[PDB]
Design a protein around this ligand. Sequence first.
Ligand SMILES: COc1ccc(C#CCO[C@H]2O[C@H](CO)[C@@H](O)[C@H](O)[C@@H]2O)cc1
Length: 158
Amino acid sequence: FACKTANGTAIPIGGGSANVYVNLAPVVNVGQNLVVDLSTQIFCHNDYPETITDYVTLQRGSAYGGVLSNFSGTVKYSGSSYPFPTTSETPRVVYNSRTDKPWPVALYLTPVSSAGGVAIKAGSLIAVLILRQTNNYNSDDFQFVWNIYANNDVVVPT
Ligand SMILES: COc1ccc(C#CCO[C@H]2O[C@H](CO)[C@@H](O)[C@H](O)[C@@H]2O)cc1
Protein backbone atom coordinates (compact mmCIF):
# COMPACT_ATOMS: atom_id res chain seq x y z
CA PHE A 1 0.00 0.00 0.00
CA ALA A 2 1.31 3.41 -1.00
CA CYS A 3 -0.05 6.72 -2.21
CA LYS A 4 0.82 9.56 -4.55
CA THR A 5 -0.63 12.96 -5.34
CA ALA A 6 -1.66 14.47 -8.67
CA ASN A 7 1.58 16.43 -8.24
CA GLY A 8 3.52 13.15 -8.26
CA THR A 9 4.44 13.45 -4.57
CA ALA A 10 4.77 9.91 -3.22
CA ILE A 11 4.44 8.45 0.26
CA PRO A 12 5.77 4.90 0.15
CA ILE A 13 4.93 1.68 1.98
CA GLY A 14 5.03 2.39 5.71
CA GLY A 15 3.52 5.87 5.58
CA GLY A 16 4.94 9.36 5.95
CA SER A 17 3.90 12.89 5.02
CA ALA A 18 3.34 15.02 1.92
CA ASN A 19 2.24 18.49 0.96
CA VAL A 20 -0.74 19.03 -1.36
CA TYR A 21 -1.28 22.38 -3.10
CA VAL A 22 -4.83 23.18 -4.17
CA ASN A 23 -6.53 25.88 -6.20
CA LEU A 24 -9.54 27.31 -4.32
CA ALA A 25 -12.57 29.28 -5.48
CA PRO A 26 -11.48 32.93 -5.20
CA VAL A 27 -14.72 34.26 -3.68
CA VAL A 28 -17.09 32.54 -1.24
CA ASN A 29 -20.04 34.12 0.57
CA VAL A 30 -21.01 33.66 4.21
CA GLY A 31 -23.37 30.68 4.33
CA GLN A 32 -22.12 29.01 1.14
CA ASN A 33 -19.54 26.25 0.73
CA LEU A 34 -15.96 26.40 -0.35
CA VAL A 35 -15.44 22.94 -1.85
CA VAL A 36 -12.00 21.35 -1.45
CA ASP A 37 -12.00 18.13 -3.45
CA LEU A 38 -9.05 15.92 -2.50
CA SER A 39 -10.37 12.98 -4.58
CA THR A 40 -8.63 14.48 -7.63
CA GLN A 41 -5.46 15.08 -5.60
CA ILE A 42 -4.61 11.95 -3.58
CA PHE A 43 -4.48 8.37 -4.93
CA CYS A 44 -3.52 5.05 -3.34
CA HIS A 45 -3.21 1.39 -4.30
CA ASN A 46 -2.89 -2.08 -2.78
CA ASP A 47 0.39 -3.89 -3.52
CA TYR A 48 -0.84 -7.44 -2.85
CA PRO A 49 -4.61 -7.76 -3.38
CA GLU A 50 -4.29 -11.50 -4.13
CA THR A 51 -3.85 -12.01 -0.38
CA ILE A 52 -4.40 -8.71 1.42
CA THR A 53 -7.20 -6.19 1.74
CA ASP A 54 -6.15 -2.72 2.86
CA TYR A 55 -8.42 -0.73 5.19
CA VAL A 56 -8.20 3.04 4.85
CA THR A 57 -9.77 5.69 7.06
CA LEU A 58 -9.61 9.41 7.57
CA GLN A 59 -8.36 9.02 11.12
CA ARG A 60 -8.32 12.74 11.84
CA GLY A 61 -9.00 15.88 9.83
CA SER A 62 -7.93 19.18 11.37
CA ALA A 63 -8.50 22.77 10.27
CA TYR A 64 -5.81 25.43 10.40
CA GLY A 65 -5.22 29.10 9.81
CA GLY A 66 -8.01 30.91 8.02
CA VAL A 67 -10.18 27.80 7.83
CA LEU A 68 -10.08 27.32 11.59
CA SER A 69 -10.68 31.06 12.11
CA ASN A 70 -13.28 31.82 9.47
CA PHE A 71 -15.17 28.64 8.49
CA SER A 72 -17.37 25.86 9.80
CA GLY A 73 -17.21 22.58 7.99
CA THR A 74 -18.06 19.07 7.07
CA VAL A 75 -15.98 16.44 5.36
CA LYS A 76 -17.44 13.90 2.94
CA TYR A 77 -15.70 10.55 3.10
CA SER A 78 -16.82 8.22 0.33
CA GLY A 79 -19.76 10.58 -0.17
CA SER A 80 -21.03 10.53 3.43
CA SER A 81 -20.87 13.63 5.63
CA TYR A 82 -19.09 14.06 8.97
CA PRO A 83 -18.16 17.03 11.15
CA PHE A 84 -14.96 18.86 10.18
CA PRO A 85 -12.72 19.34 12.11
CA THR A 86 -13.32 15.67 12.78
CA THR A 87 -14.52 14.30 16.10
CA SER A 88 -13.83 10.61 15.38
CA GLU A 89 -12.19 8.32 12.82
CA THR A 90 -14.32 7.57 9.74
CA PRO A 91 -15.48 4.18 8.49
CA ARG A 92 -12.89 2.31 6.44
CA VAL A 93 -12.68 2.20 2.65
CA VAL A 94 -11.44 -1.09 1.26
CA TYR A 95 -8.50 -0.86 -1.13
CA ASN A 96 -8.39 -4.11 -3.10
CA SER A 97 -6.79 -3.03 -6.35
CA ARG A 98 -3.26 -2.60 -7.58
CA THR A 99 -4.58 0.12 -9.92
CA ASP A 100 -4.53 3.53 -8.22
CA LYS A 101 -7.84 4.83 -6.99
CA PRO A 102 -8.78 8.17 -5.43
CA TRP A 103 -8.86 8.78 -1.71
CA PRO A 104 -12.52 9.88 -1.54
CA VAL A 105 -12.26 13.02 0.61
CA ALA A 106 -13.83 16.42 0.03
CA LEU A 107 -14.18 19.35 2.45
CA TYR A 108 -17.20 21.66 2.50
CA LEU A 109 -16.22 24.83 4.30
CA THR A 110 -18.74 27.57 5.02
CA PRO A 111 -17.64 31.04 6.11
CA VAL A 112 -19.10 31.97 9.48
CA SER A 113 -20.79 35.29 10.19
CA SER A 114 -17.64 36.91 11.62
CA ALA A 115 -15.74 36.29 8.37
CA GLY A 116 -15.12 39.03 5.84
CA GLY A 117 -12.31 40.10 3.57
CA VAL A 118 -9.33 37.79 3.09
CA ALA A 119 -10.41 34.60 4.84
CA ILE A 120 -7.67 32.26 3.61
CA LYS A 121 -4.17 33.47 2.65
CA ALA A 122 -2.28 32.21 -0.38
CA GLY A 123 0.34 29.64 0.65
CA SER A 124 -1.35 28.92 3.97
CA LEU A 125 -2.14 25.53 5.48
CA ILE A 126 -5.88 24.91 5.45
CA ALA A 127 -6.10 21.32 6.68
CA VAL A 128 -4.13 18.28 7.73
CA LEU A 129 -5.80 15.03 6.77
CA ILE A 130 -4.46 11.83 8.26
CA LEU A 131 -5.02 8.72 6.20
CA ARG A 132 -4.68 5.58 8.31
CA GLN A 133 -3.93 2.29 6.56
CA THR A 134 -4.28 -1.14 8.16
CA ASN A 135 -5.10 -4.50 6.59
CA ASN A 136 -6.69 -7.93 7.08
CA TYR A 137 -3.42 -9.85 6.99
CA ASN A 138 -0.75 -8.56 9.40
CA SER A 139 -0.14 -5.85 11.99
CA ASP A 140 0.75 -2.97 9.66
CA ASP A 141 -0.72 0.31 10.89
CA PHE A 142 0.57 3.37 9.10
CA GLN A 143 -0.33 7.05 8.82
CA PHE A 144 -0.13 8.93 5.53
CA VAL A 145 -0.27 12.57 6.59
CA TRP A 146 -1.46 15.08 4.01
CA ASN A 147 -0.84 18.79 4.57
CA ILE A 148 -3.25 20.79 2.43
CA TYR A 149 -2.22 24.31 1.33
CA ALA A 150 -4.07 27.05 -0.54
CA ASN A 151 -2.47 28.30 -3.77
CA ASN A 152 -4.49 31.56 -3.65
CA ASP A 153 -6.27 33.95 -1.30
CA VAL A 154 -9.97 33.33 -0.69
CA VAL A 155 -12.16 36.41 -0.23
CA VAL A 156 -15.45 36.54 1.67
CA PRO A 157 -17.44 39.53 0.40
CA THR A 158 -18.90 42.04 2.82
C1 LIG B 1 3.86 -14.72 3.23
O1 LIG B 1 4.46 -14.08 2.17
C2 LIG B 1 4.23 -12.73 1.98
C3 LIG B 1 4.69 -12.14 0.83
C4 LIG B 1 4.48 -10.79 0.60
C5 LIG B 1 3.81 -10.05 1.56
C6 LIG B 1 3.59 -8.61 1.30
C7 LIG B 1 3.44 -7.44 1.08
C8 LIG B 1 3.28 -5.99 0.80
O2 LIG B 1 2.97 -5.22 1.88
C9 LIG B 1 2.56 -3.95 1.58
O3 LIG B 1 1.40 -3.96 0.79
C10 LIG B 1 0.27 -4.46 1.46
C11 LIG B 1 -0.85 -4.43 0.49
O4 LIG B 1 -1.11 -3.18 -0.03
C12 LIG B 1 0.01 -3.61 2.71
O5 LIG B 1 -1.13 -4.13 3.42
C13 LIG B 1 1.17 -3.55 3.53
O6 LIG B 1 0.95 -2.65 4.70
C14 LIG B 1 2.36 -3.14 2.85
O7 LIG B 1 2.30 -1.78 2.42
C15 LIG B 1 3.34 -10.64 2.73
C16 LIG B 1 3.55 -11.99 2.94
